[PDB]
From TrEMBL, chain A:
<dbReference type="InterPro" id="IPR010982">
    <property type="entry name" value="Lambda_DNA-bd_dom_sf"/>
</dbReference>
<dbReference type="GO" id="GO:0003677">
    <property type="term" value="F:DNA binding"/>
</dbReference>
<dbReference type="Pfam" id="PF14549">
    <property type="entry name" value="P22_Cro"/>
</dbReference>
<protein>
    <submittedName>
        <fullName>Repressor protein</fullName>
    </submittedName>
</protein>
TrEMBL record, chain B:
<dbReference type="Pfam" id="PF14549">
    <property type="entry name" value="P22_Cro"/>
</dbReference>
<dbReference type="InterPro" id="IPR010982">
    <property type="entry name" value="Lambda_DNA-bd_dom_sf"/>
</dbReference>
<protein>
    <submittedName>
        <fullName>Repressor protein</fullName>
    </submittedName>
</protein>
<dbReference type="GO" id="GO:0003677">
    <property type="term" value="F:DNA binding"/>
</dbReference>
Length: 63, 62
DNA sequence: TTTATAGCTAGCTATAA
DNA sequence: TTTATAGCTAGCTATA
């Protein structure tokens, strides 16, 4: 999943940082990079009960 | 998931290490500690197509 | 609220038995 | 094969 999809999912940056257990500064860094680091994407996919999918899972499932 | 479940799943430490994209020495650390680090547990769950469950998922389904 | 970035350390890899 | 641990940096937190 892309940082903007994470922000849509929880509603804003503050709620996204609380939703995945980081500081807002981590979410702004993902947004600026246009990318969530890979173990983090797995952890977000797990912690959201797969409502958000990692790039790994989307690729594996054939997009 | 516990480090013993991870190793039983792949067959041995070498195969576990290849299976989750780490060196065997990372797997020996998890076994000796008795725990796999949290983000790592999530990655193993995703990379095994949910065949192994993180402690988080195990607890949530309980 | 967001940007920019210094500064730290968990959790790896590398190594030497 | 496994132990013990040094060497190291990605990816955070803390800040300004």
């Amino acid at each position: 999943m892309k940082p903007e999809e994470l922000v849509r999912h929880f509603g804003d940056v503050e709620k996204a940082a609380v939703g995945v257990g980081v500081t807002p500064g981590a979410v702004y860094q993902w947004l600026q990079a246009g990318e969530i680091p890979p173990l983090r994407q797995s952890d977000i996919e797990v912690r959201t009960a797969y409502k958000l999918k990692s790039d790994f899972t989307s690729q594996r499932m054939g997009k």
